Ligand binder design. Structure first.
Ligand SMILES: *[C@@H]1O[C@H](CO)[C@@H](O[C@@H]2O[C@H](CO)[C@@H](O[C@@H]3O[C@H](CO)[C@@H](O)[C@H](O)[C@@H]3O)[C@H](O)[C@H]2NC(C)=O)[C@H](O)[C@H]1NC(C)=O
Ligand SMILES: *[C@@H]1O[C@H](CO)[C@@H](O[C@@H]2O[C@H](CO)[C@@H](O[C@@H]3O[C@H](CO)[C@@H](O)[C@H](O)[C@@H]3O)[C@H](O)[C@H]2NC(C)=O)[C@H](O)[C@H]1NC(C)=O
Ligand SMILES: *[C@@H]1O[C@H](CO)[C@@H](O[C@@H]2O[C@H](CO)[C@@H](O[C@@H]3O[C@H](CO)[C@@H](O)[C@H](O)[C@@H]3O)[C@H](O)[C@H]2NC(C)=O)[C@H](O)[C@H]1NC(C)=O
Ligand SMILES: *[C@@H]1O[C@H](CO)[C@@H](O[C@@H]2O[C@H](CO)[C@@H](O)[C@H](O)[C@H]2NC(C)=O)[C@H](O)[C@H]1NC(C)=O
Ligand SMILES: *[C@@H]1O[C@H](CO)[C@@H](O[C@@H]2O[C@H](CO)[C@@H](O)[C@H](O)[C@H]2NC(C)=O)[C@H](O)[C@H]1NC(C)=O
Ligand SMILES: *[C@@H]1O[C@H](CO)[C@@H](O[C@@H]2O[C@H](CO)[C@@H](O)[C@H](O)[C@H]2NC(C)=O)[C@H](O)[C@H]1NC(C)=O
Ligand SMILES: CC(=O)N[C@@H]1[C@@H](O)[C@H](O)[C@@H](CO)O[C@H]1O
Ligand SMILES: CC(=O)N[C@@H]1[C@@H](O)[C@H](O)[C@@H](CO)O[C@H]1O
Ligand SMILES: CC(=O)N[C@@H]1[C@@H](O)[C@H](O)[C@@H](CO)O[C@H]1O
Lengths: 74, 385, 385, 74, 385, 74
């Protein structure tokens, strides 16, 4: 780089950089498939697969009240 | 006009406006049926929307293959208490990406402000950059610095269309590289005559850039970020300035451009760190000195402004406070002159101003003198003449 | 005064102050014993504090039940190297929530800036909203939009009282809905007479609202946020303005309200995006054009300021840049008139001003002219009379 | 919505929105119980339950030096 | 000279610059060889760098020990489908910290703005504080409030040298404790004569500190933060002010210091909450009242400014709004006087100003009637003299 | 504390606080060691150990494209 001290105004200017400027946007569209977890049910009581299955189902159910820009009220 | 405040909000507001105007097209039922028909065979295909824009469609199918093949065959009698322990642990590894998308879109109200490794991983970030619509010299720069392309994106949620989450990711295109830049810094420049002061201060501080023959000026320093020599600017937050604006760095005094200043009448003492040194203003009440890491105090500064090369010191002290210089390597030059503040009379200095061109501070002083001379000539001519 | 700086800090400082002021009451050993005596048989009860406020108390017992029943019987000889692998995979599923609360209050030093899914899950966010003290019209609106109620809370830590972490969560109440709003945007307005300019700019830009006959003004645009048509404002960051302040949109010069402007003497060229279009100010040095996503460039604009409907164009260009118009359906109207800054004289225009009423830029011109006219009569009567 | 281009002052006004204003706060008080993990010890060596138990005990002992007010200097 | 804009960026810029200036030294191959030779036989050792600065080096060997002894003894024939199920579950506990550091640096582009529990755990945060180079009474204070030392640090990535991630963590040293402070709050003060107003407002608000005889002033209140009585400030964001800057709080009108004010001609109505009360400014078109939490409305205020002790009320209302006061114990006072704005004729008040000394408003008004009476005397002596 | 209501200028002043000032920085250097996970292979197909091993190898190979304050050319 290279720096000058300008006395007349008490300032300083540094030159020698290079620029990397943004000029647009690019869009990638994903599709995170899940499967048929709505027709799987459990009847034996507490276990590990039951807990994981309930977590997955609850996540799918709660993702349907979130909107980017619109009010779901209607 | 205060150029630092006309900006300050354009960079982020113009990015979200363009993000939501394109989600409004993919959210239709006509386009989602068309996207999901491209990925029926492969896991990536470049598709064109209905308004002419091109997107890249990618599909994630690791969880659906587990539930289809491995899982819904060990659960036949609606019994999940088996003695396996390999499905109970495998199925807690496959749904950790799915459960981390739902957490980020649900706490950020549907628009996250950064790309995480859960939305877009690292092998799907170097497949986007290989496709961007720009030249080969720019692609090679982005493919080696992928961490600075993720840093300026965001995500938006499209919906849950049946049993599959759909979302979108906006990435920046760095289409112009290797164009000159520079930076400007400043500190108060006071004077004195028998106890009265006459301050002054520049107000054009920030980053400037050529771009194919047109200077730009980025006034808010949250917009630009250096890594070595390259500086990563955003072109939606800058204000086009005339080509003569670089004349302020040769003679601010007798020029023709309107150089911006701010005046005062009471000194300020501070240190303004610059990339290869520091600027130290010491005035009527403050004691300043410099030093080094190994040997301690080296010398004590004088009253007024002075420039401290980072090859001469390591720390600078303002009456109690220690500032640490930066150890970048470069050059230094000093350009002699007599400060502008020495040209003012401390009495008959205009009141405090805020971002006025220096051309008007001299006009304010000259107008007031002329009226006194004009009025005086009458007083002599009504009786003596 | 500059209204944009009297605000800017009121919204966050009023929210934290009202949160710590009520954790100071729940932290008494007298109130902690009263809360835990309501949850001795149930899991949710509504309790009244010592200073007349009502809260909702809820208890979490998923980890205590496992440690009391399942974990302690297996570890009887202090021999916890049992070959079970179900008591060691279960016990890592039950304390993920406990080990995430301890992680968020320990890095934020006791106050977190948002509600995660660990402090308050989603099934416990629809039980607080069903209980808030407001009408049934507002409660129903808050249940289909729960992600915008979680977005404006925060949590505070009360303590560890024995073996049970106690904390509290603040949620907003949206008590007034469906009351008119609008928004104002601006750009510079310049004129020339033989090369000299006379700029002008408005300064009352932002959101306004009605509320039972009283208008409010939200100057800092980090406070309000639209989702569709609705606007989510915070009532503690506005400034009550008079009802006449909508005459600056009808007659700005001949009115009598003090309409705020900022002036200058040098052009600026910019693009200010509005909700259904954009305002493009093109002056002496810059070249502008508009385009489309399919058919490229459309036409070249003229000098002066012009309005570009978002049904004519998709991109607007300022000498090298591209801006994306927003795609939102609406109506566009044009209100004819002759710009204010065409009534000034570029010579004898006053210096730069920052947030001054427009009644005073006309006085400053008039006062300076009265002295010149007065001064020429006195000279004549001395000898000519 | 409806947008007017005010020509005289070079500005625009957009009308037709609806407001949703905050007017107060509501407080929910939680109580996250942990049981008696302080009375369970381990005397074999490295295992899985021991690692989990040590994490839980350490988390309790750590949380008792965090204050949202009134510095604990005493 | 607007002191609120000269600051605003100094504290963050001078903290990154001092952190990258020493990562540039450890990043060499001479130091990294020398650091890892101090850690071949112990898990922590204090080392001195090449530029004289001392650091503390600490090593982590939980994942390397598992991989070396346990894992690389069952994966013999490249067969990882073994039926142990304990190695495959132990392996996912040991590498949980390694994969969480790699995510924090890869998303923040190499510099993270806070110290998560994965970079520096709580047992290693109390071994750094016990080593800092400061007195014995400052160490004791920091050890019980560690959550406020972690809150002001950051991390930087040094490299990947072979198979070992190296990084560094910057922590603050609180070297000066128990030195007086105070805070100043303000609101507009207006008058009225036959419908004309003459406003006024102070501009020196924020925190002040003493330190061995020299006062400092922190203008942007994002710098400081209280916990009880103590205030946690950052010395790189203050501006030294003269000793007699406290004469603005005793006799504002007739000192020799330049007290800073902002004037106007249009009233504003607002509430400015203070630490032990609130200042309510109610003017022509607004209605206010105060109340409690149990009962409700208590009394209604008058036009003008007034002081509402927090032992009188719990809410304050401006025409439709409710502000909850802060419940903090203390003792209040009232200091009599005649408001400064009562001294101005509402006519002949100067235009809107922005951060000017109060001596200049009085000088601006007097300079104006100096000329009018000068002209009136010359006018008579010509015709009549 | 102690608060005064300055009536002349319509302001207040609250005295009685105490200061805790920052006066420097202290530096800690960590060395997180991973072992020889670049020489171990899998040849049976899917399993739990193979997934963990792939995750760790990929994390190492990813952390070499991040630079704190320098760019990469050539
Ligand atoms: C879920 O899907 C199927 C269950 O039907 C599993 O596929 C099984 O795993 C592998 C992949 O094909 C095969 O292993 C075999 O290893 C021998 C070793 O020499 C090799 O010679 C074979 O070529 C093959 O790779 C196995 O045969 C295959 N079974 C079938 C019926 O295709 C898959 O592993 C399951 N994933 C789980 C449970 O996580
Ligand atoms: C901790 O221990 C308790 C008891 O020691 C476990 O509770 C046991 O699990 C379930 C839940 O009540 C019960 O399962 C039974 O299943 C048969 C299937 O037909 C059904 O007929 C019964 O009515 C019952 O649902 C079991 O009886 C129950 N034991 C007792 C004594 O109540 C609990 O599962 C353990 N915790 C974990 C995480 O496993
Ligand atoms: C990885 O392999 C090593 C050996 O190659 C295993 O070392 C085990 O370490 C524990 C403690 O470090 C020891 O077992 C018991 O230790 C206690 C206290 O140290 C002692 O009182 C007992 O008599 C017994 O030695 C022992 O060194 C060793 N365990 C054995 C050989 O059974 C290590 O356990 C393995 N990793 C894991 C996660 O298990
Ligand atoms: C769960 O099972 C039901 C039926 O048991 C599925 O509903 C049917 O889905 C098929 C497509 O595979 C349609 O052709 C039928 O019309 C559906 N029947 C009804 C009554 O709607 C359902 O799709 C399954 N869930 C998932 C996620 O696939
Ligand atoms: C751990 O167990 C000890 C007993 O070995 C508990 O100590 C006693 O707890 C009972 C409560 O059931 C008290 O009534 C006794 O007064 C306690 N004894 C002493 C000497 O203090 C201890 O409370 C248990 N720990 C926890 C967290 O419950
Ligand atoms: C993987 O194993 C190879 C050997 O098969 C290692 O390569 C050699 O490692 C020794 C030290 O063990 C060095 O002294 C040699 O110079 C290495 N030779 C080459 C050609 O590199 C390799 O280092 C191992 N990988 C890791 C990550 O440890
Ligand atoms: C009025 C005046 O002195 N103008 C000069 C300009 O002509 C010259 O190009 C530059 C310095 O070399 O700036 C200055
Ligand atoms: C002094 C004067 O001319 N006032 C008028 C008045 O009608 C109003 O303020 C506005 C539009 O109603 O137009 C202007
Ligand atoms: C000019 C004048 O009267 N200045 C006074 C000063 O003498 C006094 O000490 C101070 C209060 O401490 O108030 C002011």
């Amino acid at each position: 780089l290279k720096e000058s001290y300008l006395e007349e105004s008490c300032s300083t200017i540094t030159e020698g950089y290079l620029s990397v400027l943004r000029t647009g946007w690019y869009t990638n569209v994903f599709t995170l498939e899940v499967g048929d977890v709505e027709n799987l049910t459990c009847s034996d009581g507490p276990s590990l697969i039951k807990t994981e299955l309930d977590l997955t189902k609850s996540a799918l159910r709660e993702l349907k009240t979130v909107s980017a820009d619109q009010l779901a009220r209607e | 006009f205060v150029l630092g405040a006309i900006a300050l909000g354009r960079a982020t507001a113009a990015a979200v406006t363009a993000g939501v105007a394109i989600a409004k097209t993919i959210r239709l039922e006509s386009e989602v049926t068309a996207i999901k028909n491209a990925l029926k065979t492969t896991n990536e295909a470049v598709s064109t929307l209905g308004n002419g824009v091109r997107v890249l469609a990618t599909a994630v199918r690791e969880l659906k293959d587990f539930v289809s093949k491995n899982l819904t065959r060990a659960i036949n009698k609606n019994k999940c208490d088996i003695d396996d322990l390999k499905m109970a642990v495998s199925f807690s590894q496959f749904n950790r990406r799915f459960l981390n998308v739902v957490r980020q879109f649900s706490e950020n109200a549907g628009i996250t402000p950064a790309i995480s490794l859960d939305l877009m991983t690292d092998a799907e970030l170097a497949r986007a950059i290989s496709n961007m619509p720009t030249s080969a010299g720019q692609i090679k720069l982005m493919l080696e610095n992928r961490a600075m392309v993720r840093r300026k994106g965001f995500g938006i949620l499209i919906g849950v269309y049946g049993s599959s989450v759909i979302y979108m990711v906006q990435l920046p295109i760095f289409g112009v590289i290797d164009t000159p830049c520079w930076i400007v810094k400043a500190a108060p420049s006071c004077s004195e005559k028998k106890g009265n002061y006459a301050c002054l201060l520049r107000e054009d501080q920030g980053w400037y850039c050529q771009n194919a023959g047109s200077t730009v000026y980025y006034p808010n320093e949250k917009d630009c970020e250096t890594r070595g020599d390259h500086v990563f600017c955003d072109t939606a937050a800058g204000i086009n300035v005339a080509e003569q604006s670089k004349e302020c760095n040769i003679n601010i005094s007798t020029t023709n451009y309107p150089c911006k200043v701010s005046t005062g009448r009471n000194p300020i003492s501070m240190v303004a760190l610059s990339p290869l040194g520091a600027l130290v203003a010491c005035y009527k009440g403050v004691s300043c000195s410099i030093g080094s890491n190994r040997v301690g105090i080296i010398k004590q500064l004088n009253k007024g402004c002075s420039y401290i090369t980072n090859q001469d010191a390591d720390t600078v002290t303002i009456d109690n406070t220690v500032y640490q210089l930066s150890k970048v390597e470069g050059e230094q030059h000093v350009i002699k002159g007599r400060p502008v503040s020495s040209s003012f009379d401390p009495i008959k200095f205009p009141p405090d101003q805020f971002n006025v061109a220096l051309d008007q501070v001299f006009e304010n002083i000259e107008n007031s003198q002329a009226w006194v001379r004009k009025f005086d000539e009458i007083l002599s001519s009504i009786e003596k003449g």
